[PDB]
Amino acid sequence: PKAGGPLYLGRLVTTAPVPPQHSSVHTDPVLLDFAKWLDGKGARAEAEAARNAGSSSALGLDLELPGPVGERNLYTLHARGRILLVPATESGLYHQLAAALATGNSV
Amino acid sequence: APAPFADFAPPVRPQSTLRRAITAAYRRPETECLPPLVEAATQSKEIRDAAASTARKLIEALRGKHSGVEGLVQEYSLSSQEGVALMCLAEALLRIPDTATRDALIRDKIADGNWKSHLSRSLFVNAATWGLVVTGKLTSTVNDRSLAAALTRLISRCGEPVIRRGVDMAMRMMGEQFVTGETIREALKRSKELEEKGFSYSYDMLGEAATTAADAERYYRDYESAIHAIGKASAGRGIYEGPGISIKLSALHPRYSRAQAARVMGELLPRVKALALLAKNYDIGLNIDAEEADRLELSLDLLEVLCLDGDLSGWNGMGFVVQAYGKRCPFVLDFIIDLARRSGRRIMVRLVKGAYWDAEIKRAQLDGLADFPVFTRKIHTDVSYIACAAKLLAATDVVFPQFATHNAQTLAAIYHMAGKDFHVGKYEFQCLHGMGEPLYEEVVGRGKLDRPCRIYAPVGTHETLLAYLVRRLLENGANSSFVHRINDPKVSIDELIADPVEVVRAMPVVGAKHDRIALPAELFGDARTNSAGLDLSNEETLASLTEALRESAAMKWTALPQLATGPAAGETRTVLNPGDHRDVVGSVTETSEEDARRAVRLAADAAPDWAAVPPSERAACLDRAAELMQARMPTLLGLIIREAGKSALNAIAEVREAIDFLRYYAEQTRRTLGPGHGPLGPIVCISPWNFPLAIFTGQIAAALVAGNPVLAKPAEETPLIAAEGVRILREAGIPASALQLLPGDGRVGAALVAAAETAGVMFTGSTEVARLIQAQLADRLSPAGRPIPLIAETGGQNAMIVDSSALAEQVVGDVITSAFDSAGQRCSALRVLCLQEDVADRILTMLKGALHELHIGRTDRLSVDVGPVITSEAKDNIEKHIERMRGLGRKVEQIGLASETGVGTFVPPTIIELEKLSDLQREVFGPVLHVIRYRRDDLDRLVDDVNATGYGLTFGLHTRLDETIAHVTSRIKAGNLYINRNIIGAVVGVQPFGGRGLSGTGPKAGGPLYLGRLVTTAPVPPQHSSVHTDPVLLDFAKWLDGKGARAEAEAARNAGSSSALGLDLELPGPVGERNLYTLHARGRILLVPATESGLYHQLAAALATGNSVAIDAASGLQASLKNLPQTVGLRVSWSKDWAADGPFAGALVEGDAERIRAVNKAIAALPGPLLLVQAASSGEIARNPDAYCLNWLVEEVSASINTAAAGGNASLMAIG
Amino acid sequence: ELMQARMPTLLGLIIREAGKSALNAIAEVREAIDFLRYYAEQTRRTLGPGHGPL
């Protein structure tokens, strides 16, 4: 994560905290479609994990940070891009997909 | 048969001189109200100095002793969101009744994270209220994801100790501060301490705004039980020393309104009398709280009867609030003082400033009224208060003044105005529990000012108190409020003790309106004049309207084929009132198909002369027509009421909409139309019966002002108001050759559509009829060899989604209005209510109770809520649907209809409980609400189900949760969205109206793209641009360059820039609402290319506007799109069977005239939505960069958000 | 606080050791100060017993 930013300290502990201001009201639509698909096949635990990931993801965060006058300093969270998924089990793959899709990524 | 309007709105009683003086001041200009108040409020210099010294002393004592939430936030270093989230968690934990169980959950489960796992209902449902508590700022909706993050963060950081502190704080605030007690017994026990110091109490059981008979009965029994408890505790102390009760009339009847005055006097009055009789027996005060401005005068009729009722004689405990923020206040006081003299009852008069200020501003703006019924500068209310106190203090022998205020300046002014002679019973002050005690502990008692204060003491559970806590917090928490300013270190005591009377006296214009609050007529500023409505709570208006309505029923209304050459002969028949077929409204002469064809030829011959009238002069005709319709509104109302089954309220809205269309299209013309925007030619305007003046006028006005002569074919059911609209337009200067009225049925419409000179068709009506028109036009090409433009605005299957965070009373009101207003005969009407499972039973019970309070009947009575359906055929069609549903086992709730409905065609408002949204097939255009339930996790599937009907007109969402708003509004596909409000009555230029799919081709009526469809070269609409470039368009442009298609790549880049996809505007409108207008992709566009270059141009146009495409595989052009970037490939499909690969949202066609005609026929044959087709030849694509117009490749979406839904207006908290 | 108070001395070292101009040495020390205070504040906003160190 970026130095001098709110995600940094969470990389230095074994369980990351929720950083200040770190949330988003947006839900990835592909995540939503994935959760419905999991629902349909009866993967109830995974569908719940998918919905939870969709909500806790901060993808789409778009903040203005306090700073000097005459400048607008913006901070935004986007998808990483394409995530390599190395699953072992079907449930693990569904959980990995949920995490990656909820954050806007392809896999 | 009863004479039309003979019983329209008779007053409860003849209006006395004193009552008439009240009504005359209702919306009196602010500059006229203030001078007499300044005069009445003037005091000597000695008194003003003494009052200032007293106020300073009170304020110094207040500031010298001035924290619970603030101390918690400080101790745990909480952010604002953490503080709010903590209080929401505490609120939820306090819903666990058993203390040991709650503490176990805290210690073992909550404190160790995973609070979400243990706590159907968002924890944050009331976060807007807690936000006000924590931050002092109101936010209408809740950022539940921010709060969830904050709660996780604070619990993980601080653990059980912070949860414990939050729970204890919330318990204290909700049990002891926001209320005196949870029950009347607890409240009475806690009142002893301050009663021993010289305070008294008035208890508020928090009932308000009954939605159902059962609600009203519950509030009644709560008041009755409280009176017993209060009277037992009073134990003979009497009405001044002892406690009393306060009631709200709105709690005691579900239809407490002027429109239902007869039910109010017959049903509500006896309930108040029974409570008053009990208060009399215990000799306690019973105060009638004051509510919205439109209930003031009605409440006076109850006060009059009660004070004159001999059964209540001997008791002086009847009390009544008057709101000094209201322009009628001094005249109301004159009436009350006189009533006290006549009755011999020493009426207890509570003078307040007023609690509904923001809402009164919004309401007056929405209703287009002349002025506000309240002041708009806070200092005006203060002067009004002091002036009214002077009037009350001169009448203490006949009334008991009660000065309710937390403002130490107001208090001091009155304390000195009242003078040194005091006895208990002369007057008192009042304050709110848990707010006013610090001030009044400097007042009550011989060691202070030795004046008594009555504490208004809310009593109720957490659920009850939270319902309207936002309104109560704004009373003392807005930037202009004394209690906010006392706590502001930047506000000096000198500022707080400023004398409002002398400040107002010295202003350059005494009583000027607030500069930042628009009068309703000025909502749109310089763009245009807002239409004006009528106040159906104003007795003067009701009396004048009664006469105008009766006069309108004595008119010999006719509709004739008004050809350019003059009225034509034809088959003549009467037009009957749908609510009573014995009431003949007028006569219509219908147009022969021969004369319809002749009218088109005359329009074609007249086209150059009308096109040559400059746009500004055409617009001036529309503006003159709007003035004429405004002046004629009362007469137009009467015709609409009788011809179309509309209530007076709905007819007012109908005429306002017509006026607004005229003025909006006039202004849009003045902004856009020039010599190069040539008219299409004769336009056939076919309109529906259900908005028989507004949509009729809108289509015609738009076509005319764009320079097209018009053939106006109104619905066969409602020709009279259409003929009057044409008469008005002709009087306004539209030449007879430019506007021909052709009454008759669908045959006249079809004959007009098929006429060779018809250059465009504007259709509003059913989807099925639009499909027939689409098929008719598919045969046709213009002389230039291009499709005849069709605007086809069609039906809806409109849903509202309600989650567990919505306020049931608000939902039910918006549902009852959206589903059953106009007997559901609005295209926007709510058809499918979707209730989250956890709240569905409660809301459904309330909805059914509200349904049964509707009055169905002939609409020439103000008390009628729901009129008839337009015809027996419509009635039969609706009833067949109801019986089909009933036959499938679905639960059906229906109002019982009165026998008087038998003379017309009525369908009772009906609620049908469905299992799945697929139980519905097509739009049922009647008063039939369907209800489905959904589990929260299935919300996204539900939105899919709503979209799956293929309709896309209006859509409503009731939620407080930002995550749900963002989710639902991003996934729903409808043209008009409404958040936390009803889904009907879209306003021109504010909610540009129209949908997608089976609901419309667009462009939206009342929006900025409309006129551009009615000319051959569309202008650039005002504000129509976007800085955003579609990224797939950009990828396609680079691909084209890589392929060597250099000119096409440049055209693609130009399309990317020219596209207005991503336009996102807020439109001016009333306060307390945000009205947004955005341009999105249409969806999947069918491309029918002929050449590779044509395909590249079509793809560029479609991609630049955000769309995907299905390309006709029969074009043989597959090899032209080899090696597309993946981003473009995702948007591209090839279609061999167009009907299999839809629905499409538009089409682009390349070819010669006969290829275009053939393709247009094949497109018209596709199932489902009418497609907006644009065609061009290969040569046109080469010559004209705008061969395909990007205006028609985007979809307009209007969203109207009620930002007052949380209970107040945050922006207006800064307006004082 | 110590880096702020000793900034003039730190500047001299940074100027001579790392080839920085005075303005860029000021920026260097300021950035160190800001990291210290920012991570301190972010810690006060977030870290609790369950966020164990690596």
Ligand SMILES: Cc1cc2nc3c(=O)[nH]c(=O)nc-3n(C[C@H](O)[C@H](O)[C@H](O)COP(=O)(O)OP(=O)(O)OC[C@H]3O[C@@H](n4cnc5c(N)ncnc54)[C@H](O)[C@@H]3O)c2cc1C
């Ligand atoms: C015991 C008690 C009982 C009450 N009962 C009722 C009741 O039955 N019905 C009712 O409607 N109110 C009632 N009120 C009043 C209302 O709830 C507020 O408490 C009151 O209006 C606040 O006035 P103030 O002197 O306390 O505060 P101040 O801050 O001096 O005044 C605030 C008031 O100024 C007015 N105001 C604010 N901005 C503007 C503006 N831009 N233009 C014009 N006026 C403005 C509003 O009325 C606002 O509430 C009652 C108040 C008390 C104390």
Ligand SMILES: NC(=O)c1ccc[n+]([C@@H]2O[C@H](COP(=O)([O-])OP(=O)(O)OC[C@H]3O[C@@H](n4cnc5c(N)ncnc54)[C@H](O)[C@@H]3O)[C@@H](O)[C@H]2O)c1
């Ligand atoms: N999208 C909107 O803005 C909007 C607005 C109001 C009403 N509507 C829809 O209008 C419908 C109700 O109005 P209505 O009952 O008058 O609709 P309708 O389709 O019955 O009739 C509309 C008009 O088309 C005419 N007509 C009928 N058959 C025709 C034909 N074969 N060729 C040419 N014209 C023909 C009628 O005479 C009438 O003037 C509802 O479906 C409602 O949802 C849509």
Ligand SMILES: OCc1ccc2occc2c1
């Ligand atoms: O908050 C005090 C209060 C008391 C009675 C009321 O009646 C209507 C609004 C209102 C406010």
Ligand SMILES: [Mg+2]
């Ligand atoms: Mg019809």
